[PDB]
Amino acid sequence: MSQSNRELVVDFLSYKLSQKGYSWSQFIPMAAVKQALREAGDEFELRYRRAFSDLTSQLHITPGTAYQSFEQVVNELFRDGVNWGRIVAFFSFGGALCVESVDKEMQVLVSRIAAWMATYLNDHLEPWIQENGGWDTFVELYG
């Protein structure tokens, strides 16, 4: 559902902001899906520690930035189509964006970024997720 996904997005971003020393006040959601995603994102960031610096540069978010700009930049993660690792990269990218906004004194955008991510997932990623076993296979697969 669209609500499960919005909740999942908020949990990841809150977890990531909290984990880095930031505030999370600016704000399938099974506890298992959320824990698996929390850990998958940490593992991903273990290997890739550049925080999508160029992707974020490409986006260059301000309060004037439109969803479609976000969408175009995130589309780059999926040039070769969707996969579980790329969906984990997507969540991680949103986390990075949220950190940059707080750093730029634009805490106002973290809730915007969250809405955007929820809209992107429901629109572009859920089609592949449902086709590939749903968040259940994600959990079966990860942690």
**In order of start, what are the domains of the chain with their CATH numbers?**
1-143 (1.10.437.10)
What tokens does 117 get? 């991510």
What tokens does 4 get? 């499960």
Gyration radius from the chain CA atoms: 14
Please list, in sequence order, all residues whose beta carbon lies within 8 angstroms of the beta carbon of residue 106, skipping any fewer than 6 positions away.
61, 62, 63
Cα torsion through 48, 140, 134, 85, rounded to 10: 10
Tell me which amino acid residue 9 is. Answer: V
Phi, psi of 47 (to 5 degrees): -75, -55
Alpha carbons 88 and 121: distance in angstroms, whole number: 11
Q: Where are the beta strands (DSSP E) in 11-128?
A: none
Alpha carbons 4 and 15: distance in angstroms, whole number: 16
